[PDB]
PDB file of C-alpha atoms and ligand atoms in Angstrom:
ATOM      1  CA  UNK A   1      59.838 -17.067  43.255  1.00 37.88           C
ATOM      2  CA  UNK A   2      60.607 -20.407  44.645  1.00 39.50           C
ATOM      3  CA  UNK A   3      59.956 -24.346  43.493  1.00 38.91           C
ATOM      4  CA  UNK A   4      56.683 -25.600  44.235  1.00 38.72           C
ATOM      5  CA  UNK A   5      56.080 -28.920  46.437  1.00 36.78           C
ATOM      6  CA  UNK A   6      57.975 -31.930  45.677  1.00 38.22           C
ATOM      7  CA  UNK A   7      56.310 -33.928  48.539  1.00 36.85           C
ATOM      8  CA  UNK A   8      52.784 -33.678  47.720  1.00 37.63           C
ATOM      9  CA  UNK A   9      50.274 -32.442  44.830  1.00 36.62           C
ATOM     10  CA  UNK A  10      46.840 -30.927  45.758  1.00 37.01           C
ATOM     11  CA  UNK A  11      43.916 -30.912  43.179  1.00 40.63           C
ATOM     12  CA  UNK A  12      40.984 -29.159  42.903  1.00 40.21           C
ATOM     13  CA  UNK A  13      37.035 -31.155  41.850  1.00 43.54           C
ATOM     14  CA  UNK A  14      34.032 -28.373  42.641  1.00 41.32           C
ATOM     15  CA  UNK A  15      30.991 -30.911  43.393  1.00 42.16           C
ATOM     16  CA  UNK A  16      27.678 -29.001  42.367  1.00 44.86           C
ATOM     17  CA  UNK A  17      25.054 -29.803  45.131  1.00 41.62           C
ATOM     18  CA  UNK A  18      23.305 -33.358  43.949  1.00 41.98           C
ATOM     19  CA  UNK A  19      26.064 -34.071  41.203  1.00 42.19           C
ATOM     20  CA  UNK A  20      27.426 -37.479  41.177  1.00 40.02           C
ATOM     21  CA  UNK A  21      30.658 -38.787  40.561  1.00 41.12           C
ATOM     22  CA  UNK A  22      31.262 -42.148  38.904  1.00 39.47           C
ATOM     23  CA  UNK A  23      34.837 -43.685  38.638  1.00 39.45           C
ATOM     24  CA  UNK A  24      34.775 -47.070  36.636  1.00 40.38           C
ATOM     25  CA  UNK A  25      38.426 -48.887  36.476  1.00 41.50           C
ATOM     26  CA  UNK A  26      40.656 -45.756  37.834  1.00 41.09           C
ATOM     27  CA  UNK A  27      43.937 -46.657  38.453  1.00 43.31           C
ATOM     28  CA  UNK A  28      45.588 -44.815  41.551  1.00 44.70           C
ATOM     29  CA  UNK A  29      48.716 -43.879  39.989  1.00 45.54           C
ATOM     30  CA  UNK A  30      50.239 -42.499  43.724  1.00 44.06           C
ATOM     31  CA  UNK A  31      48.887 -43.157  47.167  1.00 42.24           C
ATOM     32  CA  UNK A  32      45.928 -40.418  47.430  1.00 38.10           C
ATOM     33  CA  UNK A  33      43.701 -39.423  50.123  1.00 36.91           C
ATOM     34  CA  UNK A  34      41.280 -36.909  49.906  1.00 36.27           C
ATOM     35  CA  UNK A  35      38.016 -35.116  51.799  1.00 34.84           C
ATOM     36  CA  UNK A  36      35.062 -32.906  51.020  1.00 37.28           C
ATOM     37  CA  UNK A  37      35.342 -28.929  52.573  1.00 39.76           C
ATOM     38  CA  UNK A  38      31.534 -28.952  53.799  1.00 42.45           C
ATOM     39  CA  UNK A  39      28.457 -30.398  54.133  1.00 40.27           C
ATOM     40  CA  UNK A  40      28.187 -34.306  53.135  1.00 41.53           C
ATOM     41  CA  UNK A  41      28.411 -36.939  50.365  1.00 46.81           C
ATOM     42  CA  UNK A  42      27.331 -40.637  49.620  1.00 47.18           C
ATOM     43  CA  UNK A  43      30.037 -42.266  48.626  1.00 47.81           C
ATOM     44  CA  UNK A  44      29.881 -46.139  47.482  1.00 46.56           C
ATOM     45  CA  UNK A  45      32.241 -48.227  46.905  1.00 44.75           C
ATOM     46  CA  UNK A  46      31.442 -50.926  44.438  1.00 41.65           C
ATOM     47  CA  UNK A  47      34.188 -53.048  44.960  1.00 40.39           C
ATOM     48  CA  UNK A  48      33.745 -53.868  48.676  1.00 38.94           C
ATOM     49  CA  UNK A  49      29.943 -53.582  47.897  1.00 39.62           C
ATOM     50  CA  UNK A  50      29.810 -50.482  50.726  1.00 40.35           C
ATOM     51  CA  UNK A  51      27.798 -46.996  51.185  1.00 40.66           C
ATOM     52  CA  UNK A  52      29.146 -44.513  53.452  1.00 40.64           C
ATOM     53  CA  UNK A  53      28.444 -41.382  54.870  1.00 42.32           C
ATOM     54  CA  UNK A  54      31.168 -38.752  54.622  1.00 41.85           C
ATOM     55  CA  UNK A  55      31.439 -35.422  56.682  1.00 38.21           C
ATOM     56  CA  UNK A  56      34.018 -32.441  56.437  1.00 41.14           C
ATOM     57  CA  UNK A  57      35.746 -34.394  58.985  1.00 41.29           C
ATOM     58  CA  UNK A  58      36.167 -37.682  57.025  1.00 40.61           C
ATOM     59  CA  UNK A  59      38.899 -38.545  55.195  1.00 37.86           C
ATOM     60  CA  UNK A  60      39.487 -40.971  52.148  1.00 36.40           C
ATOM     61  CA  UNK A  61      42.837 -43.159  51.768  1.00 35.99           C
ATOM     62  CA  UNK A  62      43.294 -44.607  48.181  1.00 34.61           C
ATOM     63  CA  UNK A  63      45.830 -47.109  48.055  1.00 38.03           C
ATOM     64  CA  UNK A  64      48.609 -46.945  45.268  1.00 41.35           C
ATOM     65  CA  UNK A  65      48.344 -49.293  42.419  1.00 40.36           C
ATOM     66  CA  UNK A  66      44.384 -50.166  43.116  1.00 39.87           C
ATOM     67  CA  UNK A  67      42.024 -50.223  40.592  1.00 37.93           C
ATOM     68  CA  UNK A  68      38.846 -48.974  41.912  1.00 36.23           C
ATOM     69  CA  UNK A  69      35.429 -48.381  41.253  1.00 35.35           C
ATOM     70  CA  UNK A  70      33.061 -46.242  43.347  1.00 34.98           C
ATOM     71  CA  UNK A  71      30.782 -42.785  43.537  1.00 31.68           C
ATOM     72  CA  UNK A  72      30.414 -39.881  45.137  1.00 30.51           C
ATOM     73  CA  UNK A  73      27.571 -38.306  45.482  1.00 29.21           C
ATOM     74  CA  UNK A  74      26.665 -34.747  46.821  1.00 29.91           C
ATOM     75  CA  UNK A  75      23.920 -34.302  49.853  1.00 28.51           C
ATOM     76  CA  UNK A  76      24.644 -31.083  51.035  1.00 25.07           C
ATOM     77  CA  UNK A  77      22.143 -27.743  49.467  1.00 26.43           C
ATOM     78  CA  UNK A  78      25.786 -26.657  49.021  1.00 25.60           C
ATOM     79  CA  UNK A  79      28.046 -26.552  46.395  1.00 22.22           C
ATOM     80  CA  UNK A  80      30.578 -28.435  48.000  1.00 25.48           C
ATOM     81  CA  UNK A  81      34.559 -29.342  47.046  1.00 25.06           C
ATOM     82  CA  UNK A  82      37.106 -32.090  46.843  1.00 24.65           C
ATOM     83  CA  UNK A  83      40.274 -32.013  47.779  1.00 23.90           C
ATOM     84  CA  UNK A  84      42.757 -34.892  46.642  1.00 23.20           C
ATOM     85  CA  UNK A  85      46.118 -35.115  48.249  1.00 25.60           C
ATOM     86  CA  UNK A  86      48.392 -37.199  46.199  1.00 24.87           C
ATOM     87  CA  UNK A  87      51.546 -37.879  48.400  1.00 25.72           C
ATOM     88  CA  UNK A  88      54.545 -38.409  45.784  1.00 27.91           C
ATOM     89  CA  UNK A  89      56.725 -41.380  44.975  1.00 29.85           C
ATOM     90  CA  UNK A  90      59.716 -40.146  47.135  1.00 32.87           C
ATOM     91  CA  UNK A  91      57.695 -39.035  50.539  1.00 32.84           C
ATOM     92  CA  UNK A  92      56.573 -42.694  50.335  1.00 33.26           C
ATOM     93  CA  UNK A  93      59.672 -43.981  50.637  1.00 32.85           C
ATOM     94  CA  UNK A  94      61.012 -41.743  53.506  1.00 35.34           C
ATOM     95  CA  UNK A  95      57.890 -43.170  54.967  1.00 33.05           C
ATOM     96  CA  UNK A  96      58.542 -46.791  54.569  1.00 35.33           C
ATOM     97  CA  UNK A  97      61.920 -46.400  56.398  1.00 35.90           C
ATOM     98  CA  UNK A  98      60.867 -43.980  59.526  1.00 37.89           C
ATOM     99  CA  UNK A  99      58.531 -45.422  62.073  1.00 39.50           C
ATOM    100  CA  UNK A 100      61.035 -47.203  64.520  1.00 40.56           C
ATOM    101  CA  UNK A 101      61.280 -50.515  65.578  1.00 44.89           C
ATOM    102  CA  UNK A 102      59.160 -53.375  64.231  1.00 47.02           C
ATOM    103  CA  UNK A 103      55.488 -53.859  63.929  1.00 47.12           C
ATOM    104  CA  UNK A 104      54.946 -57.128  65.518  1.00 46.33           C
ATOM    105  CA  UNK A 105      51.007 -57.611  64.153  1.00 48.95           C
ATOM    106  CA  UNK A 106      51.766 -55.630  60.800  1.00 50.49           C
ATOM    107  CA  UNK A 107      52.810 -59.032  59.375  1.00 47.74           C
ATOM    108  CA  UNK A 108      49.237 -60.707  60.319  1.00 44.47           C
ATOM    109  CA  UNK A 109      47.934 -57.562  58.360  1.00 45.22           C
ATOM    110  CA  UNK A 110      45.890 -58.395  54.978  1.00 46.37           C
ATOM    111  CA  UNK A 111      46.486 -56.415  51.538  1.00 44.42           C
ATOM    112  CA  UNK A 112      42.464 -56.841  50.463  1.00 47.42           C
ATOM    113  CA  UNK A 113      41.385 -52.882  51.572  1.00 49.76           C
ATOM    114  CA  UNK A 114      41.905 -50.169  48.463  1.00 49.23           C
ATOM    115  CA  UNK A 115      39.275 -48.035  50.046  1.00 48.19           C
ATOM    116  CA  UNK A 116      40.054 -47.137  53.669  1.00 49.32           C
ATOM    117  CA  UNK A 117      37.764 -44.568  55.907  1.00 50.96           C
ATOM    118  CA  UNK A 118      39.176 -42.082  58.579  1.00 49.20           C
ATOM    119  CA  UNK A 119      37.186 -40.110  60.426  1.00 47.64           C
ATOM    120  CA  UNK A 120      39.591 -37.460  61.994  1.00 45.57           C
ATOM    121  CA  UNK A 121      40.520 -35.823  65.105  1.00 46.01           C
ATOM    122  CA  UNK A 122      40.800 -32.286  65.315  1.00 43.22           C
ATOM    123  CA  UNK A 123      44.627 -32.778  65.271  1.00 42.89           C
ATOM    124  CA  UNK A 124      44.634 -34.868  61.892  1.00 43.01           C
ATOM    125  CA  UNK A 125      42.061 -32.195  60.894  1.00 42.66           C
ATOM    126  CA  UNK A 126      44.153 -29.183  61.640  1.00 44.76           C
ATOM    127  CA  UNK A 127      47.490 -30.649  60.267  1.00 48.96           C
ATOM    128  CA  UNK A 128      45.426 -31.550  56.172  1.00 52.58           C
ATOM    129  CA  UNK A 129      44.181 -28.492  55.793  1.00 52.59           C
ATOM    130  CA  UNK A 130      47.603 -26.693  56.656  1.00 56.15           C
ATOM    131  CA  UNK A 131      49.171 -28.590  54.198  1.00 60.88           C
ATOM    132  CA  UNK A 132      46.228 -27.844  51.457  1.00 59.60           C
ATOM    133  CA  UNK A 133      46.046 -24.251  52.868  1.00 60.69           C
ATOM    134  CA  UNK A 134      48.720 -23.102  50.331  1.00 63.49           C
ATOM    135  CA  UNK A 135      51.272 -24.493  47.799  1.00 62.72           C
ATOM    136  CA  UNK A 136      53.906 -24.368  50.515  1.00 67.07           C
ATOM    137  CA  UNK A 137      53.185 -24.707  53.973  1.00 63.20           C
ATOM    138  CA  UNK A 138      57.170 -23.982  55.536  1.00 62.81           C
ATOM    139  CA  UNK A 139      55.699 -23.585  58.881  1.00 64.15           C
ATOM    140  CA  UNK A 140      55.788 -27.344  58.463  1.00 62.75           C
ATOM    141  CA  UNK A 141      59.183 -28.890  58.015  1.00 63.36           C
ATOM    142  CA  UNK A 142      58.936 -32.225  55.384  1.00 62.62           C
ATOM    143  CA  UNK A 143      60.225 -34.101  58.563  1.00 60.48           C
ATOM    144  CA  UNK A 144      57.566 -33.172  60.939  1.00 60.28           C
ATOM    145  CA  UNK A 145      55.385 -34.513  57.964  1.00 58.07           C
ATOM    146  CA  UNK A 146      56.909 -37.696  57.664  1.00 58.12           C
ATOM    147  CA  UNK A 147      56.549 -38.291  61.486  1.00 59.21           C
ATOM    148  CA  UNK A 148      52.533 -36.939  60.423  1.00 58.92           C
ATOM    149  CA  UNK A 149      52.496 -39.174  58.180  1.00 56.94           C
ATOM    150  CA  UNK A 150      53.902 -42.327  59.175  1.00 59.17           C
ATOM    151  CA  UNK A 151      51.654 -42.339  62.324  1.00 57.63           C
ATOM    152  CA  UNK A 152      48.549 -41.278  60.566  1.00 56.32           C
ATOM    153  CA  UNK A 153      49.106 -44.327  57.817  1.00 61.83           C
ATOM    154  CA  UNK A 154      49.972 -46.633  61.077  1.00 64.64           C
ATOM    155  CA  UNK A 155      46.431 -45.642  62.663  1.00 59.79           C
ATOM    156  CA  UNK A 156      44.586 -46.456  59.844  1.00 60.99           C
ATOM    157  CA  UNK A 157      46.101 -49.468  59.198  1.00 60.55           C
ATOM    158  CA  UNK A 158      45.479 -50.479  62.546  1.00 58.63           C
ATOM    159  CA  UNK A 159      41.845 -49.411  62.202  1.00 59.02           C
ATOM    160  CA  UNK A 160      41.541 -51.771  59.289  1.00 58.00           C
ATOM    161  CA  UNK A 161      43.899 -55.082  59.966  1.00 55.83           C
ATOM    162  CA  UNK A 162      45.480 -53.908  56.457  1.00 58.01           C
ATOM    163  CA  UNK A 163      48.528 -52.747  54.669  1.00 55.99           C
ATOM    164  CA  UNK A 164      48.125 -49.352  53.381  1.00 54.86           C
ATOM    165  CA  UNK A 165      51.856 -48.169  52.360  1.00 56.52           C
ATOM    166  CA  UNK A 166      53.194 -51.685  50.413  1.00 54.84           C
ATOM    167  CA  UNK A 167      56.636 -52.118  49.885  1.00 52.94           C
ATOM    168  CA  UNK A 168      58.331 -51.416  46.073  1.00 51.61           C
ATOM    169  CA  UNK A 169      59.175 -55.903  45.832  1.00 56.57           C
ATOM    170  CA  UNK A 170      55.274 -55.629  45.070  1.00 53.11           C
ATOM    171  CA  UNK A 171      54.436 -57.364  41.591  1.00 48.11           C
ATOM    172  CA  UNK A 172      51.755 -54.586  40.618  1.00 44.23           C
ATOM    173  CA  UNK A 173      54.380 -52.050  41.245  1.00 45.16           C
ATOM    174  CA  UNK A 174      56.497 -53.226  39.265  1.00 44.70           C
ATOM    175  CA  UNK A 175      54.399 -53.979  35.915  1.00 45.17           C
ATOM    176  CA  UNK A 176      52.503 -50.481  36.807  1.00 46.24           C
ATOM    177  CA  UNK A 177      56.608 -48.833  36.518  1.00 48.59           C
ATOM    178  CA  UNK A 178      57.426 -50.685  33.802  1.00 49.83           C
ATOM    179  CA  UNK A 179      54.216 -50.133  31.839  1.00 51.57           C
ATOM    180  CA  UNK A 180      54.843 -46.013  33.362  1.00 48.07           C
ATOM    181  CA  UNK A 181      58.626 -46.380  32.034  1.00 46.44           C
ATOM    182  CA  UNK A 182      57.330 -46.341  27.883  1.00 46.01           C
ATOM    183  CA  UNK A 183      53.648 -45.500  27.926  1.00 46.50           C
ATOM    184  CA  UNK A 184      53.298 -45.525  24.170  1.00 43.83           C
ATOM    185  CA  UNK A 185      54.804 -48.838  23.530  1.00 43.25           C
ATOM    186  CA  UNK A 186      52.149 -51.274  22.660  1.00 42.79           C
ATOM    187  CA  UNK A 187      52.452 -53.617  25.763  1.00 40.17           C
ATOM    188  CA  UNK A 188      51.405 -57.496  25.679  1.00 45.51           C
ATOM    189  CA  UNK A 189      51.111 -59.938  28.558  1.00 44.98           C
ATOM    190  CA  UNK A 190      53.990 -61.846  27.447  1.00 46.43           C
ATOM    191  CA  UNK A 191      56.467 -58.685  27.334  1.00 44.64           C
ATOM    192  CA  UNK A 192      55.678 -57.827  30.750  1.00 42.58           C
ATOM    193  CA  UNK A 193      55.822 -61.250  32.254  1.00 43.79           C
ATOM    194  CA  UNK A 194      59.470 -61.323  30.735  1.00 41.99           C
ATOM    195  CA  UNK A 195      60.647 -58.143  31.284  1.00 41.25           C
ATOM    196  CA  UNK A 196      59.699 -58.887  34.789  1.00 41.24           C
ATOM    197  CA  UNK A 197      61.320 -62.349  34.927  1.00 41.47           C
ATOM    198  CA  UNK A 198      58.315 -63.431  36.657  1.00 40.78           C
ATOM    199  CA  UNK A 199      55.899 -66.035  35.663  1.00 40.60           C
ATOM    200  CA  UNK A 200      52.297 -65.643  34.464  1.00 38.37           C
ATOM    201  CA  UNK A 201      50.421 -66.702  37.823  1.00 39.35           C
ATOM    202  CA  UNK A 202      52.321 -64.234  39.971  1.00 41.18           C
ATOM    203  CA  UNK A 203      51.652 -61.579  37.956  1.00 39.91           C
ATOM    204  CA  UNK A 204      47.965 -62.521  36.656  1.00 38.40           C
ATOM    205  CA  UNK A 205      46.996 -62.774  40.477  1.00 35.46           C
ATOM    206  CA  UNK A 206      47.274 -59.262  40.406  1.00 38.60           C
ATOM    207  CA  UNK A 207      45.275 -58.459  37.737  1.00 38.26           C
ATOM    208  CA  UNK A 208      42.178 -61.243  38.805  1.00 41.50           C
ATOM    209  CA  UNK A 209      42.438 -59.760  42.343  1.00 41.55           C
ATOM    210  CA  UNK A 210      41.487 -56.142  40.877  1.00 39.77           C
ATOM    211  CA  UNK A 211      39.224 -57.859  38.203  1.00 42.47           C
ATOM    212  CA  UNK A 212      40.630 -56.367  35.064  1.00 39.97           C
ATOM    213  CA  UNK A 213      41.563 -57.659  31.864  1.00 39.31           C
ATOM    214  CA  UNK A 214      45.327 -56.919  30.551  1.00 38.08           C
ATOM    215  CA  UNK A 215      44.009 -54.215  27.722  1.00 38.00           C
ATOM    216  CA  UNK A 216      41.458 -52.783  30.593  1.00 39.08           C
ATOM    217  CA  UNK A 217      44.988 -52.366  32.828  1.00 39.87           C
ATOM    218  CA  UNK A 218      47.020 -50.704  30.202  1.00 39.49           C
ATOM    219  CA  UNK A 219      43.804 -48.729  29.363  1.00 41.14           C
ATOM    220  CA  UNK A 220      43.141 -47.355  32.762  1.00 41.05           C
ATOM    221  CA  UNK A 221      47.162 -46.934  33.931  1.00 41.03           C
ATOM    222  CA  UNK A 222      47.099 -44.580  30.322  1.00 43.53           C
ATOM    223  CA  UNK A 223      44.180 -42.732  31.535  1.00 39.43           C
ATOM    224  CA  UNK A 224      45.710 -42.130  34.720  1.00 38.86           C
ATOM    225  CA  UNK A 225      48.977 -41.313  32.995  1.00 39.51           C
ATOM    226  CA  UNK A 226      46.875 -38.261  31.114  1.00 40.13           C
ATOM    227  CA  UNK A 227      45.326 -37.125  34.129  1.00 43.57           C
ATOM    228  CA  UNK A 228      48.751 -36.524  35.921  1.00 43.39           C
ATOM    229  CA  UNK A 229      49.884 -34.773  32.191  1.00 46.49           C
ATOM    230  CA  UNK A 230      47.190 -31.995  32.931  1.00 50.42           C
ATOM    231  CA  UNK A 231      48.409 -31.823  35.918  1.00 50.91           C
ATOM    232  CA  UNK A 232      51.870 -31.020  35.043  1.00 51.79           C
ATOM    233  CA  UNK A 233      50.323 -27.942  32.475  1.00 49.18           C
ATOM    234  CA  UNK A 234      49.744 -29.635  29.639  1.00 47.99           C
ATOM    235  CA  UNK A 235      46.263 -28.893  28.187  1.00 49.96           C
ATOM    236  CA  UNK A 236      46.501 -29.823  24.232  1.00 53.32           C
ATOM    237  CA  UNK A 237      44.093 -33.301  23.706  1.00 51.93           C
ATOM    238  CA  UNK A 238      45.385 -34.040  21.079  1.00 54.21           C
ATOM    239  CA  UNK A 239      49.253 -34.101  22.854  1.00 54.44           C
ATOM    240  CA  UNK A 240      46.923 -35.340  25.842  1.00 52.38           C
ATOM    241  CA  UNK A 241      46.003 -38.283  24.028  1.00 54.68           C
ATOM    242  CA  UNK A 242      49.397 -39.346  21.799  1.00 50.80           C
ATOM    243  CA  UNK A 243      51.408 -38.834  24.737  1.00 49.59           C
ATOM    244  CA  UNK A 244      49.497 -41.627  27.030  1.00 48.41           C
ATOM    245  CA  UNK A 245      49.823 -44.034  24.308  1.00 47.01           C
ATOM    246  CA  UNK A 246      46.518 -43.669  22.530  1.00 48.03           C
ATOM    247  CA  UNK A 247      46.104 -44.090  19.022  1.00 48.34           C
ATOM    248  CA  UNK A 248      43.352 -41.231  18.605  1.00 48.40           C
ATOM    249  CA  UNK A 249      41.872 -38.497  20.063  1.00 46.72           C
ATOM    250  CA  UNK A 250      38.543 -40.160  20.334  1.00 48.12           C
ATOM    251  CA  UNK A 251      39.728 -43.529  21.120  1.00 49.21           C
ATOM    252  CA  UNK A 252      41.121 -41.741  24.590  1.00 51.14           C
ATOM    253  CA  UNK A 253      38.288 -39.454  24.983  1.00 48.43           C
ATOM    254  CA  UNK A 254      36.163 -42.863  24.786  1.00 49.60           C
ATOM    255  CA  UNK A 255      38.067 -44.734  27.245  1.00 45.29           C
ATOM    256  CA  UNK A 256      38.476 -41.357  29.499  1.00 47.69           C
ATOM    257  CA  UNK A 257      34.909 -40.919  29.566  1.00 44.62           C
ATOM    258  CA  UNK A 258      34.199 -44.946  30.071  1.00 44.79           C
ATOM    259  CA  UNK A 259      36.434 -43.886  33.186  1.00 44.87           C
ATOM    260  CA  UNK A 260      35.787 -40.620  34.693  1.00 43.64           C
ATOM    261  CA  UNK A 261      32.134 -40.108  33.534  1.00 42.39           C
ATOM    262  CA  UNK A 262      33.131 -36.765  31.902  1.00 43.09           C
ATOM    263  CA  UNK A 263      34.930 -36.013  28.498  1.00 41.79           C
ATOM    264  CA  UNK A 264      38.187 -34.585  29.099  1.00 38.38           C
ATOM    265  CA  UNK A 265      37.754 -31.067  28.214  1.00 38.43           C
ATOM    266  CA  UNK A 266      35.011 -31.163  30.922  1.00 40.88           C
ATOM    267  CA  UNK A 267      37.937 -32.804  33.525  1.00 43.62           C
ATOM    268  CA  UNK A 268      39.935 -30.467  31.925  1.00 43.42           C
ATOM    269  CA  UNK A 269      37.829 -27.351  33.336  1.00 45.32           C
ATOM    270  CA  UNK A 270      37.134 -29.070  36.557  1.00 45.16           C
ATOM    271  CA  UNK A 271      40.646 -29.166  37.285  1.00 46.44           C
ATOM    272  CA  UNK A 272      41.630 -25.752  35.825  1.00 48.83           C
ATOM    273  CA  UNK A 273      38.819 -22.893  36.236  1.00 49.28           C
ATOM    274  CA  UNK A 274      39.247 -22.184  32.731  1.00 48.79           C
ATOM    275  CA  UNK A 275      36.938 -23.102  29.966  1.00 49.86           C
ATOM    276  CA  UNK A 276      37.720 -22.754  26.301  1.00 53.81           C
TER     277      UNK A 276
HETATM  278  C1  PAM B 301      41.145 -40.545  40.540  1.00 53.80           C
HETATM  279  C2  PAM B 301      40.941 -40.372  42.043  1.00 53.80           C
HETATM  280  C3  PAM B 301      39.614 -39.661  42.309  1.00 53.80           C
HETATM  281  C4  PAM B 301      39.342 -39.656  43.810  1.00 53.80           C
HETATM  282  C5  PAM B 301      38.995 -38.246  44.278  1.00 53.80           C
HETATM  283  C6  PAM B 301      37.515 -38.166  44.643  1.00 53.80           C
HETATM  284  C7  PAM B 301      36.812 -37.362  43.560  1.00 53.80           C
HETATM  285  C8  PAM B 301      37.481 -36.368  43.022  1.00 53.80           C
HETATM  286  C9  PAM B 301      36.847 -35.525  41.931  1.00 53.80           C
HETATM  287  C10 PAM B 301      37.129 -36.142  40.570  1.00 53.80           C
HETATM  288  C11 PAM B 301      38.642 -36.135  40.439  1.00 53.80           C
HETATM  289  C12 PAM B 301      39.136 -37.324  39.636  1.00 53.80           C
HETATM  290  C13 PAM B 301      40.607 -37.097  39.301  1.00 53.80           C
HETATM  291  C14 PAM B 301      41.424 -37.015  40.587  1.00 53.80           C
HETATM  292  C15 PAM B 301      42.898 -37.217  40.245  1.00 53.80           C
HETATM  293  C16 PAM B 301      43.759 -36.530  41.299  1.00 53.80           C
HETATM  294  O1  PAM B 301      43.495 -35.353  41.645  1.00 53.80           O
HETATM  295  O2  PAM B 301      44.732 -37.133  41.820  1.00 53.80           O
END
């Protein structure tokens, strides 16, 4: 028995045929990009006011630190399946510092694009579902996956005149680490603009640009926050809950449905094939 992936995470959403899937406010904790196994799905963005069309060969980059708002929406008779590839903290990183030479247009590039669409090519198709085949690949070393990677991101963003992968002097990273750093503590404008020794324009920019209130923020980085927690194992509510910073069980189940459409045990059995 060996360690599991310290690169990546995979997760696991069964769409029944004609179910819909409404995320209001999410907050993309890591940069995630996921894709449907079969068939096809409506999926709308509300932000960018947008309805696409999305095949087994589509893909779906979600930028890190975004706030966004859309639905997906089975079309297939088929009960169909998403797969969500979160790429972790570290991989990034490595990314940032390993395409070679400079980008001459990247810095005419705009930030504006949380939702980006890539329809792939039987190369980009082949190399995804290796990686989600199993919970280790090792016929693919991390480095070939970086070099993946970093040229996949690079075609994308070249698709879209738009930074995907930011760098870490970004203000919404920082409040979104600091805010990460002591989930419980009960957080106020003022504490962060200090902490962060940055004035309230820079940093309220970022929340106007992804049209949330401070308390919706904290809200929606907390529900993100217990998502990743069932991730790691933990399937307790109530520990769910207290742990994210919530002062009740159905304070967070409110919020987490006001978020994910679904209560959290139902989330909870989405993620993990077992019910009660
Ligand atoms: C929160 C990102 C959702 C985007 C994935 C598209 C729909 C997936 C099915 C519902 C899953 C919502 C939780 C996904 C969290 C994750 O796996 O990283």
């Amino acid at each position: 028995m060996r360690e599991n992936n310290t690169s990546f995470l995979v997760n696991v959403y069964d769409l029944k045929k004609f179910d819909t899937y409404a995320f209001n406010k999410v907050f993309i904790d890591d940069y995630k990009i996921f894709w449907i196994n079969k068939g096809s799905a409506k999926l709308v963005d509300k932000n960018c006011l947008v309805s696409y069309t999305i095949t087994a060969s589509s893909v779906v980059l979600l930028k890190k630190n975004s706030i966004q708002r859309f639905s997906l929406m089975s079309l297939s008779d088929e009960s169909i399946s998403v797969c969500v590839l979160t790429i972790k903290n570290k991989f990034v990183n490595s990314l940032r510092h390993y395409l070679q030479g400079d980008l001459m247009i990247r810095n005419l590039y705009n930030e504006k694009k949380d939702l980006l669409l890539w329809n792939c090519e039987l190369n980009d198709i082949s190399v995804l579902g290796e990686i989600v085949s199993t919970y280790d690949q090792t016929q693919y070393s991390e480095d070939f996956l970086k070099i993946f990677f970093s040229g996949f991101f690079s075609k994308v963003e070249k698709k879209y005149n738009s930074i995907f992968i930011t760098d870490d002097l970004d203000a919404m990273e920082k409040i979104s680490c600091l805010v990460k750093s002591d989930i419980t503590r009960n957080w106020r404008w003022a504490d962060i603009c200090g902490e962060l020794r940055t004035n309230r324009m820079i940093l309220k920019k970022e929340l106007e640009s992804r049209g949330v209130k401070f308390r919706e923020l904290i809200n929606s980085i907390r529900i993100s926050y217990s998502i990743s927690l069932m991730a790691t194992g933990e399937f307790k509510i109530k520990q769910i809950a207290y742990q994210s910073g919530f002062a009740s069980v159905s304070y967070f189940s409110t919020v987490f449905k006001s978020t994910m459409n679904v209560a959290p045990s139902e989330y909870l059995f989405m993620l993990t094939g077992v019910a009660e």
